[PDB]
Amino acid sequence: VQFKLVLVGDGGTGKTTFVKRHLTGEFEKKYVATLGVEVHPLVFHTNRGPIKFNVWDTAGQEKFGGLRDGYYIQAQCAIIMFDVTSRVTYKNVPNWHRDLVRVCENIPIVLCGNKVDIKDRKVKAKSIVFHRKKNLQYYDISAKSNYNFEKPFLWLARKLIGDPNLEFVAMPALAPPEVVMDPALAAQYEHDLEVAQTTALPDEDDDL
Amino acid sequence: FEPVVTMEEDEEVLYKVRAKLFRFDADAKEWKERGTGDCKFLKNKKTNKVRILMRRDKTLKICANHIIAPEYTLKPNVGSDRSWVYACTADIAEGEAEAFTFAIRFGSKENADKFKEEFEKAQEINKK
Amino acid sequence: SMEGILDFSNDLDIALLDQVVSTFYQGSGVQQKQAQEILTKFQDNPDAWQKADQILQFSTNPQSKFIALSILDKLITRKWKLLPNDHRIGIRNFVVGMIISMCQDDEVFKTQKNLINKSDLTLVQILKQEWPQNWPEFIPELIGSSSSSVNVCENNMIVLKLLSEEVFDFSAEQMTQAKALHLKNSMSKEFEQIFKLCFQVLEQGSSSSLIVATLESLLRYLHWIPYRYIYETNILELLSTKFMTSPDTRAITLKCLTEVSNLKIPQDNDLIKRQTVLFFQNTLQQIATSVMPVTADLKATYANANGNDQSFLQDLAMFLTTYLARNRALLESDESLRELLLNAHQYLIQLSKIEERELFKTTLDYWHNLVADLFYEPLKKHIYEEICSQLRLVIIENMVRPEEVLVVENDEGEIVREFVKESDTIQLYKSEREVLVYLTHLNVIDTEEIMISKLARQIDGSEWSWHNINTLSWAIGSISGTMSEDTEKRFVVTVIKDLLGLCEQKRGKDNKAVVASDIMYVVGQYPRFLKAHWNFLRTVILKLFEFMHETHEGVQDMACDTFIKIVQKCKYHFVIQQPRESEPFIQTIIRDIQKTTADLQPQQVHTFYKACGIIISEERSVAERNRLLSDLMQLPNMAWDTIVEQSTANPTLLLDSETVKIIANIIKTNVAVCTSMGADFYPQLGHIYYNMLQLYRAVSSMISAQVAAEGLIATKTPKVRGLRTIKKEILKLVETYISKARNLDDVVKVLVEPLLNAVLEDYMNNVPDARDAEVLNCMTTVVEKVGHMIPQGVILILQSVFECTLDMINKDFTEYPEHRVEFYKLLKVINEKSFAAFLELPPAAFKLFVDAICWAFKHNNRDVEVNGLQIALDLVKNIERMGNVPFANEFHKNYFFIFVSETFFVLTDSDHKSGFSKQALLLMKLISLVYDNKISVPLYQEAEVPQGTSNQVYLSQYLANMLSNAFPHLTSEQIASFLSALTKQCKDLVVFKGTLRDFLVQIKEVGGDPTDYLFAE
Ligand SMILES: Nc1nc2c(ncn2[C@@H]2O[C@H](COP(=O)(O)OP(=O)(O)OP(=O)(O)O)[C@@H](O)[C@H]2O)c(=O)[nH]1
Ligand SMILES: *[C@@]1(C)C(=O)N(Nc2ccc(C(F)(F)F)c(Cl)n2)C(=O)[C@@H]1C
Ligand SMILES: [Cl-]
Ligand SMILES: [Mg+2]
């Protein structure tokens, strides 16, 4: 039970950062432009059982475009990403959508305005109307603050499973191994622990 | 007159606190967030064994699942007065038992100190 | 082994290709990643297109053929004119032939839609290159071949749709002005024949899928075709009746009718008015009979989400809102049209109950449009009385949580503090407020009656819930200012009375927290009432003080914000002595400030002091204000005085992390009160200023000492972050004060010298990772307000910050982002207000300055880029103002071409799209300097060109050469023509920009037409 999901949008909009957040929980601060596409399995647990998205996270930058519209072939859903602190990224949403629906007629699509966490927003809420005539779901999101971060996937799952009351649910949690001891020595542990202590945790000003 | 036609039920909650969990990536020499949500100390009513179970907010995906082993030691992180670091040899959150160096930061220093107190109590319970 | 296809010295193994392609799309893991890299390298091989015909004939994988066509697409769009004419005919023929071939096999046509759509688009790319000048008969032959096969007819509608899109909808970015006009005019000239085929198919058409394709093509034509094709054929009848009954055509027809609606027809013509009414009447008739009646529960229907129902309801809302926004007046006068008007609005009412945020916003925009019109337009609101009354209910019951309400219910059913702000919710609240405010004005009796009787049903418990008391409370608060003061009086009294009763009658913490938040919101929203009722105002403040002791953190926080909010509006009533009161209330507040704030978090305490500052500033007697200010600051001033004794007895007491916190909070407290009091804060700043700058020095020392003893890692420790917080808050306080100061003489003679001495050298002489970017921010404000009065000061600031900061930010674009931003804001203000400081720079440092400006251009960071281009524009104006003198002559000789070429570089590299306007402006200014002989000396060396040669001629020559080497695939004429146009247009910015946009298109392909640059002329 898996669905091909294409993620498109201008470079630097936060596509890869968003996916990573979903994969590992991590927040990647550095900008390493995606080369072509990266495919990632991504599973969610729902009251209608597990759903798997094969996420085709594509390149936004023309020079790293690679296959371009070829990546969309047989996609069953998509996310279009822009950045609310960069007007040009919204101005380009129609171009991404054009290329996407020429290959993928009739699929559920979410439009996402990333980086709402940043104070000086440039693409005002009132401005964001492109999705209406194109029947796209829209969400304000922030990969950084995790604001509405689940919403794109919950909505897509609802559309693809065809159940409007689908919820994410708590995955079962097996009793973990009581046999903690593996190597008697644990020499390797001591080197890692000292390094880990003396490397500062990021974002020590955040509320958590 | 005929009418209308997780595995945590068997565990007790000793302690719950909001927190952010990191794991150390030795290759990158950087801390990476693994999850944000409720960190719970769960005492199995059948074994009396106490575990950490932590779920991400909204997705509810497990980002920590491991026994509060007697051998573990909470250590300070150079950057924080509200975090603990420790080595864990068997976390099954992402499936197959794996070793991680974890860090866990709290909203306040009191929370961090409370966590440490509870953590050491749970270690005691786990010894018997 | 997959890498075989990359080797072009051999024939392409097609079977191997298909394996690689299959592995990418259908495979996984490492094999998928390897296959992806290989296909990418294959595709980008500039000879790969030669293998295209091979892959189309011999492949058994549709994705292989897709990728072949992508290879062809990239050839056609970028290098088409470079091919000899044989290859152009050849490629055309096998694209056209493959399309015909795929449409004739019924099974392939059915199952290979992706591949055929890609083929059609590829054909359209060829049309853009050769139609119609080298393909006059494309359109007639397309129309002819349409009767030959139903599959070919259908596919032709796809081709025409794609063509209309490419010419009319997406041409602006992707073609020159001239080419876009050529192709629009060409489509326009042959549209008559296109339309007849399209109308034939619609009248007599059998195949449902052909009808759909034809309607899809029509949707695109409605963006541009003349009105006559719509209103002088029978086509409106067809859309609004026939094509609305069948559900497979309904969707596209409704979107088509929406586009027609959106046109503004000539008002004078009665016949067009009749038709605009009729298609609407027909459409609503087909909806009532074939889809759902007006009473249908669209909220339930949307929630069920059967088939396409959600999409259809969306499209219906778009149709009704679009049409009624531009044409409802046609329905408002004629009695026979009143049912139709009200039914359309009744549908909208039903649509507005759908639980779906973004749809709600679409309907809410329409309601705003209507209620705003009914507010001004005479004799209209009576028509919509029953609609508006229903709407009042919908909105009062769907009010979203305002910013100010900080309690919310979680997934365990507890009322708690809000984790974060909601900006999506914020705009929605404002939109709801606007409509509901208008609705209230349109019938204030109805609004009051709905709200009051809803309140009655909260009391008696019939409708009691958290949701129900909340939405109601928020709506009641939202309409503040709509009523008379007397109605407001009675209304607010009733509301408060009943909310207090709710509170008594409910038990438990959660309940008390809900009703507390609701009362707090309401009273905060009615300052006018509070102003006129001192006894009540006093009570709520005293009650807010009580809430500052609440253990429920949500309520605590909200009391603090409500206090500030009431104070922002009612401050005058706190500063004077009210009747029956012994003293002004500010006096009462200040006396208990210790007990009042004792359970608050530091930042809440600061808010409290800020609020008190708002009040104190209301007192215009200098003696009394300064005294109140003295009184307010008594706790922090006592703590401060005892800290400064201990601290200056020995610099070791400051190590204590508890002491660092105390100091930080003292300064923060000062910042809070300065923020609200501005210029009135000066005496308090004077009390602490000299000792504070000594503390800044002492704290600096400890930071440097720590970094020496522990390493760069020390900057991450709690102790050092706390010490740095002290420096940041000190800088913030000085910035805040100087930003609002009225007496600038004191700033210059008292504040500036000690400040510069305390901060500049400390910044300069710290390691990069220990420099506070807040220093730069402070200096920016200093230069902003008093720069003109401290010329030697500004020089000192540059010396101390300019080169060391530049070296931090000039290795990459990523590191020290805060310094980066503040740095360019500093240079901007210095260049505006104190340009002399840049003249006094040694030549080497002036060169670094220019390097710094151009460096800013190349940022993607909008904060840096925007300031970069501004500095450059302002520098040029600064130089031009100096007139004909040696510094200006040397500047032009040294830097004019650097600025021109650097501006061109960022214009043309496709990585700085965001700064296009300002880039263009800078470039225009530079070129105009030469065309107005505002440069007094030659920009070329004597040996280099013939003596007496004008700068105009030399600039042409320089630029031609630059572009020739930078873009070698352009012809000489392309470059000559562009520069000729560009230089001519250097006073008309919008034309100039058009010429640049034309250039950015042409550099992306070969053989661009040089005559395109005559498009304005
Ligand atoms: N403040 C903020 N920054 C973000 C957010 N999401 C991503 N970023 C940052 O913005 C940059 C975006 O990086 P990516 O996710 O690599 O961008 P991309 O869209 O994948 O870019 P391409 O791969 O070139 O298409 C990174 O530096 C992220 O740390 C967000 O929600 N808020
Ligand atoms: C409960 C909400 C309530 O009514 N309380 N008393 C009270 C008295 C006066 C005021 C006011 F309006 F500010 F003057 C308020 Cl908000 N509440 C409570 O104390 C309960 C929280
Ligand atoms: Cl906004
Ligand atoms: Mg990416």
GROMACS .gro file of C-alpha atoms and ligand atoms in nm, chain A residues 121 123-126 140, chain C residues 423 426-427, ligand 3:
model
   10
  121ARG     CA    1   0.692   3.744   0.580
  123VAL     CA    2   0.396   3.658   0.059
  124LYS     CA    3   0.097   3.776   0.258
  125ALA     CA    4  -0.189   3.536   0.342
  126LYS     CA    5  -0.433   3.750   0.134
  140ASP     CA    6   0.108   2.760   0.580
  759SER     CA    7  -0.051   3.355   1.141
  762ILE     CA    8  -0.462   3.570   1.223
  763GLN     CA    9  -0.554   3.689   0.872
 1356CL      CL   10   0.037   3.733   0.658
   0.00000   0.00000   0.00000
